[PDB]
Amino acid sequence: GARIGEMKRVTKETNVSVKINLDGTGVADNSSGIPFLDHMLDQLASHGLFDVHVKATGDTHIDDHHTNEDVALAIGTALLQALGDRKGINRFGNFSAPLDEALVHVSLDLSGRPHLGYDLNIPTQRVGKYDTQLVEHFFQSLVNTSGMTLHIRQFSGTNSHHIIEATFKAFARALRQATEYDTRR
Amino acid sequence: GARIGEMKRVTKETNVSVKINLDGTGVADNSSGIPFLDHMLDQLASHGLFDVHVKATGDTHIDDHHTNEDVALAIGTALLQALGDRKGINRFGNFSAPLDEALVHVSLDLSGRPHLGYDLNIPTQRVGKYDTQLVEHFFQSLVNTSGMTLHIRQFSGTNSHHIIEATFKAFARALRQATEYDTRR
Amino acid sequence: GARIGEMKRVTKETNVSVKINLDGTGVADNSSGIPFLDHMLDQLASHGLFDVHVKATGDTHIDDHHTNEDVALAIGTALLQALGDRKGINRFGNFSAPLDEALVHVSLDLSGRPHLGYDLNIPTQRVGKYDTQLVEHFFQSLVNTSGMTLHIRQFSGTNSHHIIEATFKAFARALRQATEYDTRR
Amino acid sequence: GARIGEMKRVTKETNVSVKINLDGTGVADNSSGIPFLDHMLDQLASHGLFDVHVKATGDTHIDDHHTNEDVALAIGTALLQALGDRKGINRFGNFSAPLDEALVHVSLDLSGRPHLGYDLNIPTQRVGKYDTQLVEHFFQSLVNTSGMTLHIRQFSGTNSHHIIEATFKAFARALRQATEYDTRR
Amino acid sequence: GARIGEMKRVTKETNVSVKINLDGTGVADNSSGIPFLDHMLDQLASHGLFDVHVKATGDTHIDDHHTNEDVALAIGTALLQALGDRKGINRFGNFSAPLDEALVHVSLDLSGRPHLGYDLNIPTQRVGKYDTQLVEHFFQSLVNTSGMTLHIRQFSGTNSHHIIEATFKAFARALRQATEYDTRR
Amino acid sequence: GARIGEMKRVTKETNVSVKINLDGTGVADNSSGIPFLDHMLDQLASHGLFDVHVKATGDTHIDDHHTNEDVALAIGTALLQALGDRKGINRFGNFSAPLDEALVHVSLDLSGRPHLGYDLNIPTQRVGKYDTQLVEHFFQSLVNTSGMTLHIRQFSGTNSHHIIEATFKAFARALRQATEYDTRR
Ligand SMILES: [Mn+2]
Ligand SMILES: [Mn+2]
Ligand SMILES: [Mn+2]
Ligand SMILES: [Mn+2]
Ligand SMILES: [Mn+2]
Ligand SMILES: [Mn+2]
Ligand SMILES: [Mn+2]
Ligand SMILES: [Mn+2]
Ligand SMILES: [Mn+2]
Ligand SMILES: [Mn+2]
Ligand SMILES: [Mn+2]
Ligand SMILES: [Mn+2]
Ligand SMILES: [Mn+2]
Ligand SMILES: [Mn+2]
Ligand code: NA
Ligand code: NA
Ligand code: NA
């Protein structure tokens, strides 16, 4: 059976629905209210081969912060539920993903203990309309509800879009590795 | 057949017995006379899926140095014997293992040529009763008798226990990769 | 209607049992297997007016790390259970506690989002047999399971025992304020 | 069917013939007119398990530059042709290869967009008769005709031969990974 | 006609008995109450070919300082008595002893004038339970009662046990050379 | 009962045959395919009074590296065989050899534990056709197969030929002292 986690949460500020299939085929279905975040969540599907369904509405007239945060929290919760007892999985994941001049390494452990190590140098404040401070907050919130150990280290990159997209590719491939089953155990 | 190496050696200072199964199931059986080293040798089993049997007695009333050294030498010798002609194996191993804020990369080659590259920053002198200088000596001695190329690089970490434990996890997973058989060749 | 939380957790490394009364009278009953942590948990009772009961055994022959962590994890969970729906409480707590030359400020929010801001300068590595790296790990683990926002800032201090004890007094008094009921709410 | 690419090109300066089998068994057949480059192309076969056939003649009486360049261009073209529509492959490759004191990480993406990130510190100007400036030009030209994203980062090394050879091992193993088929998709 | 010196001194703090044979065969019988010093005194015997017998009890419940000092004072006196009129001996001794990464040079003159030039950089405070400040005090006390000119210079070394042990190997070999007879004289 | 070691090793890269007599008369018979290494191996014979016989062919059309390494590896193994059980030997050797403006100290121990401490500053890249990076590789490979502790320290020198030759003279004289018998043992 496919490991599926879902979370729905409605607050005064946001309305969030997420479903994730750890054993998916790369189905991307992301409409967070934040177009650049949808593009990044798409990478999680096509590079991690997860099925990622995110539908969010929120107070984006204020800014994208609350939506960005609640989507990440909900994804963390869904990821945690889909993992179940976590028996038999690789648990650790590693990947360095280039995107042209950008190169980001992600190392993670599905440990049950939240920690974010974040070392990105994003040189512009907006990619499209997306506030680039929200990248760090996305991953911080995600590790907080999933209980993940997550390290993101930038080795190269000047274009903010490239840097952020490379981060999500490496994250997706590291998370795919960590969630996959260890054939020897 | 399982690739098993054993070494027994008795000196004036130490009495060392080691057995390693490269094709194990993660059986940990470590009583080196150094409780913190036993914990680290346990990681070698649970994360490398080796079967690791270490029984040592020694002149720990002086300090843990001679025991620490002779255990490492013996493990290196057992690892070398279990490897045999080394035909068909991956030979190289790579892994970055986080432990909370700690992150250590290990890259190794079962080359037949000993070399230790060691770049850890352990900020305290004792973890429990374990002298933290012995970590470097453990790996130096191990590479010396096994003929291993070994690189240990710390990217992150403040807690000495975390740093050392992350080193052993990454080592175990890199060594597992290097000792496993390459299915294409 | 006293707010009581309890947590038992047994692992291969530790056996931990904790009970905390947010509306206590300062009853301390702490036997963690780490005498200096017991002294600090006693401070939590007498300065926060909590009833704190901690009974733990663990692999202290390796070092104090696993016990220290699992005790803090359990206290964090017990604290979360005792808080219930969190209706009517002050939620925020603030206190600056001097201890002779030491002065530590604690600012915290029972927010549901874990974060530790930690800025202590403990100039020695051992207080008694207690590894001073474990202080930061204690609060980090506690915030992780309680979902607390916690900021610890040293304004003064040279004696390690003083710095750490001032931290626990300030934490105890800040948490007391936060868990107390807002009379206007 | 095996993914085979071939390129032949004759200019006033050079006569180049290359054939590559992405699904090979490690057959090395390299006679570029540059003995040290042949040794490096051999690594591509034995460590990448490609079948690599290179036969070049050229104006080496001037220097090795034109031959070095045209061999790399031709390899890039052959690699591109063998890849075809690139459906189903891993596409990304990662490897850190030690050679004694040397350690080089290679991260690559078969993206269709050429880019070389090159960070090697080769401390001598000649390895044998091979001008060490040609290493960078080899990879630059190769990425140019294959459309590859390629990052080469030196973490360690003092012997120029070791550094260069470690680069080619890591490249071969990263390229093997990138060209291999993803079993899940 | 073997040169044997012997000192016995009982104080409120320690009870010390030492016997040294300059023309010995390496018989070690050292029980100073300080295990690490015993290990070092054993090196004095096997590397200098002295017969070294040290028996001591002392207020080690305070620390090892008084025992360490009084043992060193007693050996120096015994060494002085064994040397007699010092006629015919080499008088000067020189040796550089490696111990793995450590390298210590000892140059000495059995001059009748005490002087210690001491240039060791011991990076940890305890080897086992042995306070590494006691190394300098040992040699300072020994030169004071023997009337020796002694220079100890560290050229290399990171492991504290190695540095100290290389120091005693080089001292023993330099002292052996200095106490041996000059055949032309 | 002369102590003689021999080693033949044939690889696809090199064909190496070495014979060494620890109790020789300085007979040199060196044809390694590297004329400058031959000159240095002649120094080993005349200054150490070893009989040194080296016959090698190899892929010197690539560069001198593989030949240089395999010759040193073989000499190290032959040296180890000739040493036998190592009973009665001095084991340690020390020598400072001037050559005009050059001055190099060699300190070594036939310990069974490989370590190279290497501190030479060779200011040119080629002595004749000999790549000066290969000097360090020669001694590193030799210590690895002989199990020698070896420290090489340049105190003076500007001419590369002088620096390297002084190194071989000091090494030859130090190894002679170490392999000679301790008359008192
Ligand atoms: Mn807000
Ligand atoms: Mn926020
Ligand atoms: Mn994009
Ligand atoms: Mn040692
Ligand atoms: Mn642990
Ligand atoms: Mn921990
Ligand atoms: Mn107190
Ligand atoms: Mn040109
Ligand atoms: Mn060009
Ligand atoms: Mn090579
Ligand atoms: Mn004193
Ligand atoms: Mn020792
Ligand atoms: Mn080499
Ligand atoms: Mn010459
Ligand atoms: Na979308
Ligand atoms: Na155990
Ligand atoms: Na060839």
Side-chain angles (χ1 to χ4, degrees), chain B residues 22 92 133:
Chain B
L22 302 183
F92 295 85
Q133 292 206 314

PDB file of all heavy atoms in Angstrom, chain B residues 22 92 133:
ATOM      1  N   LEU B  22      30.896  -8.375   6.360  1.00  0.00           N
ATOM      2  CA  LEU B  22      30.570  -7.334   5.393  1.00  0.00           C
ATOM      3  C   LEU B  22      29.161  -7.502   4.860  1.00  0.00           C
ATOM      4  O   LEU B  22      28.555  -6.524   4.415  1.00  0.00           O
ATOM      5  CB  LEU B  22      31.571  -7.347   4.222  1.00  0.00           C
ATOM      6  CG  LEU B  22      33.055  -7.155   4.545  1.00  0.00           C
ATOM      7  CD1 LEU B  22      33.914  -7.126   3.293  1.00  0.00           C
ATOM      8  CD2 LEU B  22      33.253  -5.869   5.346  1.00  0.00           C
ATOM      9  N   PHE B  92      34.318   2.506  -3.918  1.00  0.00           N
ATOM     10  CA  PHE B  92      34.212   3.873  -3.419  1.00  0.00           C
ATOM     11  C   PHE B  92      32.919   4.019  -2.632  1.00  0.00           C
ATOM     12  O   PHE B  92      31.903   3.407  -2.960  1.00  0.00           O
ATOM     13  CB  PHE B  92      34.220   4.893  -4.563  1.00  0.00           C
ATOM     14  CG  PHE B  92      35.510   4.950  -5.336  1.00  0.00           C
ATOM     15  CD1 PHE B  92      35.739   4.069  -6.380  1.00  0.00           C
ATOM     16  CD2 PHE B  92      36.475   5.897  -5.044  1.00  0.00           C
ATOM     17  CE1 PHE B  92      36.914   4.115  -7.121  1.00  0.00           C
ATOM     18  CE2 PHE B  92      37.656   5.951  -5.775  1.00  0.00           C
ATOM     19  CZ  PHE B  92      37.879   5.047  -6.815  1.00  0.00           C
ATOM     20  N   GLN B 133      40.632  13.275  21.385  1.00  0.00           N
ATOM     21  CA  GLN B 133      41.760  13.062  20.488  1.00  0.00           C
ATOM     22  C   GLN B 133      41.773  11.653  19.902  1.00  0.00           C
ATOM     23  O   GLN B 133      42.400  11.432  18.855  1.00  0.00           O
ATOM     24  CB  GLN B 133      43.074  13.306  21.235  1.00  0.00           C
ATOM     25  CG  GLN B 133      43.321  14.747  21.633  1.00  0.00           C
ATOM     26  CD  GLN B 133      44.804  15.053  21.780  1.00  0.00           C
ATOM     27  OE1 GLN B 133      45.565  14.291  22.396  1.00  0.00           O
ATOM     28  NE2 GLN B 133      45.233  16.146  21.170  1.00  0.00           N
TER      29      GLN B 133
END
